[PDB]
Design a binder for this molecule. Sequence first.
Ligand code: BCL
Ligand code: BCL
Ligand code: BCL
Ligand SMILES: CC[C@H]1c2cc3[nH]c4c(c3C)C(=O)[C@H](C(=O)OC)c4c3nc(cc4[nH]c(cc(n2)[C@@H]1C)c(C(C)=O)c4C)[C@@H](C)[C@@H]3CCC(=O)OC/C=C(\C)CCC[C@H](C)CCC[C@H](C)CCCC(C)C
Ligand SMILES: CCCCCCCCCCCC[N+](C)(C)[O-]
Ligand SMILES: CCCCCCCCCCCC[N+](C)(C)[O-]
Ligand SMILES: [Cl-]
Ligand SMILES: [Fe+2]
Ligand SMILES: [Zn+2]
Lengths: 246, 281, 299
Amino acid sequence: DLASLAIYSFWIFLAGLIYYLQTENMREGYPLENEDGTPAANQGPFPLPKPKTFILPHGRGTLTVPGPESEDRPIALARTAVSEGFPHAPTGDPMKDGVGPASWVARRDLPELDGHGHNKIKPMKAAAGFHVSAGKNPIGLPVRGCDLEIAGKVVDIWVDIPEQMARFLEVELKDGSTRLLPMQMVKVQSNRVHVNALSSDLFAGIPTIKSPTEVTLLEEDKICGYVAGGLMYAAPKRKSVVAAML
Amino acid sequence: ALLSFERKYRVPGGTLVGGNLFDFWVGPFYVGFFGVATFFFAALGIILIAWSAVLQGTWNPQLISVYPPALEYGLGGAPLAKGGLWQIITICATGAFVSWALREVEICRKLGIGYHIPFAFAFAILAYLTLVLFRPVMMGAWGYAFPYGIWTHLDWVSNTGYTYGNFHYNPAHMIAISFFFTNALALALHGALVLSAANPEKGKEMRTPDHEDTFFRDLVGYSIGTLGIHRLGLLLSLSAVFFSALCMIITGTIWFDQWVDWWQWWVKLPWWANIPGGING
Amino acid sequence: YQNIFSQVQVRGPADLGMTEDVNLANRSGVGPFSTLLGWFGNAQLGPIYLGSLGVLSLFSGLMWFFTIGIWFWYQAGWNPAVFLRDLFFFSLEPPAPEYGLSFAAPLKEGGLWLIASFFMFVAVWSWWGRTYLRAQALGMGKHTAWAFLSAIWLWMVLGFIRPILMGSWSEAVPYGIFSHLDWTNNFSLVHGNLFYNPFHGLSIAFLYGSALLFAMHGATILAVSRFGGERELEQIADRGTAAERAALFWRWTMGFNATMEGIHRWAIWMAVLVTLTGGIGILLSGTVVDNWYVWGQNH
Ligand code: BCL
Ligand code: BCL
Ligand code: BCL
Ligand SMILES: CC[C@H]1c2cc3[nH]c4c(c3C)C(=O)[C@H](C(=O)OC)c4c3nc(cc4[nH]c(cc(n2)[C@@H]1C)c(C(C)=O)c4C)[C@@H](C)[C@@H]3CCC(=O)OC/C=C(\C)CCC[C@H](C)CCC[C@H](C)CCCC(C)C
Ligand SMILES: CCCCCCCCCCCC[N+](C)(C)[O-]
Ligand SMILES: CCCCCCCCCCCC[N+](C)(C)[O-]
Ligand SMILES: [Cl-]
Ligand SMILES: [Fe+2]
Ligand SMILES: [Zn+2]
């Protein structure tokens, strides 16, 4: 029967596909390791796929995967139990050491370029022709933290030029310096910009950028990781909704 | 085992219940309170099902089937062999699903990401609940729910649909299908676009997002963008399920006849209901 | 903030796009900006590429529509009021069984349907060539062309391959809103309930699985958009915390995960398999299997 031969061949095919797909999704993070960094005994039933190489544009080299794990910086965490499977608590300050929900990866310390080789992101004041076209303009507004105190004021908006979107809000602190705050982590209101993930006293600690006109992938990760970290690590300072409702 | 970059993330905190009592992993799986609650519900439910198989007299996956209480039982309890077992199992599934979502929330909290995923999953749960809980209750009997059996539930689909003629005519059903089709269309486009840029012609440099935009801009005169496409996929999927629940929640509760007949309202509009000619004239 | 809708829209000079090897002369001018679309995705409309292939596609595409439209107007007695109240009931039906696969049917008895099918045939295939060429011109992979074929395959089987194998145009699908639904329902009845067709069941699994996977992937990316997660191409070339937290959410939840590039491979196949399996199921109906219930009893 043709129909029977077909359905029979299909399952053979599907299994081959899932096998292919799965190994293909092992281009990163494998081989697995024990909680101490050494090679784990069990690597699973799927073998590592053969290497592939990406040719990166704008003279930025190439990327070959699978390959040796890129992360090598120190991780400020210590084992909690003798057996595998338990948490590893922070040995110092997780927000500063970059661990837990405040982790960051050592991405290339250069900015992301667009199709032409221009910096993808840029402060609006330096982005020819860009302006706020809809919604409340946040520039000039005071920025409030989860402790319900003012942490600064918005002095600019950093825009993604190829995609024409707001990505960061440049906030000026009391000391006259500034930090970048992720757009998807702020709430623009009519009379202020609220940042739930951070208490006023934590703004100063936000990682900074080398140049005032650009931001690197490395800096973005440090900035974003640190801000997200405040959801867990700043909880003690985060006031209730009823307090905020006042 | 862990992924080569996992260590720094296995930090304590995030649980919604029990503090650190269940704050740990087993292999790759994280547990948490809702991790053990899910196991509890899944086990009790699978066990109760295997027992229903016995009373049925078979251990064949293609044959096993747990039916709900017969119409006669209304919305009350029933003998464990004539509906009651289905009733307990339904309670277990709901607990297992909700616990799964809540477990996802704990994981989100630990990793410091958004809660979009469990929020999305909640849509599936509400669809299941619509067929098994909300519609039966509104209709007045557990009997209207569907049976748990690989083939038996397909029989329920067929019989239920034909109870109203060709179900295709259900307006809400039409919209739900649109979303399902459009979703599959978008998923294919998005998958293909990202890959076509990451994997250009052999020997060439990896393409950029600008190339993705240009490709679709040339093709159809518009590009929703990288952020939007993900917003879109989520919207189409959820809307598809939202309209599935709606097409069912109104069937047999406020609409009882042949769905095809509902469309007569448009054909009977005053200004053209009697004009001679055409299909309906 | 959930990042479903943007809080503040920003705009700048229109983007004309990468040049690469494309014939800039065939690129139209930029369109207007939509503040409305801007809340959900990009606000910019256009430019669009319009070479000869695209012009041919648009033309026969319009002709296909026109052909259906004129028959509907004739069915309406050229009365706009009747045309609008009976719009969903009109139907352009194919040649009766007696005509077999010949092009001899009279206009009002299948000839118009054949003409309509010719235009749609060209429109679709020329558009397919277009998806390939626009990709080639930019040096990109042909993933969009290949995926489009899977959809084309179900369409081809329904109105061309199967009807030819059955040896009759009467086996094809008519052009009408309600008529093509009646056709679908009837098709299942005539072949002994498609719920017994294994390939129809797989197709459903994939249709369901596509909404499952996109809900999954879409919500994931947004969940890590606070780390620039949607810039997937760069996350592939230089993994960030976004890609790591996304992979770990799933590993900790279900025991396994994907990568920024690999997830899009799961995605393309989940969708593609929908119409790939569906096509096989329909192609086997009536040619190899007349009744899937009976077929199932012997398997
Ligand atoms: C002859 C039958 C009638 C008909 C009768 C019906 C009936 C009756 C119903 C539908 C419903 C649906 N129909 Mg119909 N329909 C017809 C023809 C069609 C055609 C077609 C091409 O012609 C299409 C495309 C559709 C499409 C649709 C969908 C919109 C919808 C089902 C999906 C859904 O609800 O998801 C919702 C998703 C869920 C319910 C899934 C929930 C999953 C849960 C939360 C978790 C499970 C986890 C699992 C246990 C884990 C196990 C562990 C493992 C490790 C995984 N119908 C014909 C005309 N249709 C259904 C609907 O709208 O549902 C509300 C419905 O009840
Ligand atoms: C949504 C509208 C109808 C419905 C209509 C249909 C129709 C019509 C068809 C199916 C089909 C299927 N249905 Mg159903 N089904 C309904 C509700 C459910 C529920 C539920 C808890 O709500 C479940 C778990 C299932 C499960 C199933 C699968 C066995 C099968 C493939 C689905 C799939 O791949 O999805 C996509 C999801 C994935 C890709 C994830 C993987 C999920 C795996 C495959 C689920 C296995 C479930 C396991 C056998 C159930 C018991 C597990 C434990 C013992 C508890 N259906 C509602 C009532 N279903 C198809 C089939 O072949 O049926 C025989 C089919 O043709
Ligand atoms: C009573 C009716 C029968 C039934 C009869 C059929 C029949 C008949 C068929 C299906 C098919 C399908 N059925 Mg069924 N089906 C039943 C019940 C169900 C139920 C259920 C009850 O839950 C579900 C969920 C489904 C689900 C499904 C889908 C998995 C599948 C359609 C795939 C698709 O993506 O097509 C949509 C995609 C396309 C049609 C491809 C379109 C591609 C072309 C190229 C587009 C051209 C567009 C054009 C140029 C014009 C517009 C252009 C503008 C620019 C917009 N069926 C009942 C039992 N079903 C199809 C299948 O594959 O089955 C195996 C099929 O033929
Ligand atoms: C709402 C939009 C779509 C969607 C989204 C969605 N599903 C999700 C998520 C999301 C975003 C998850 O995060 C979660 C997940 O982890 O996926 C990997 C999930 C999930 N969607 C799943 C399945 C599923 N989703 C479906 C549909 C949908 N999911 C929609 C199309 C469908 C179908 C048929 O369309 C299925 C089968 C699971 C794979 C997974 C949730 C896993 C889970 O809840 O596990 C806990 C429970 C158990 C391990 C077992 C409990 C066993 C019961 C006690 C038995 C009860 C029997 C049952 C009632 C009948 C079964 C027999 C059938 C023949 C009827
Ligand atoms: C006759 C229809 C054929 C449809 C098969 C198309 C599958 C699309 C596969 C994505 C392409 C993947 N890739 C890079 C390895 O070619
Ligand atoms: C790559 C996607 C993996 C999803 C596989 C889904 C399998 C569910 C299969 C149920 C269909 C069984 N059937 C109808 C063919 O007999
Ligand atoms: Cl490839
Ligand atoms: Fe993506
Ligand atoms: Zn540039």
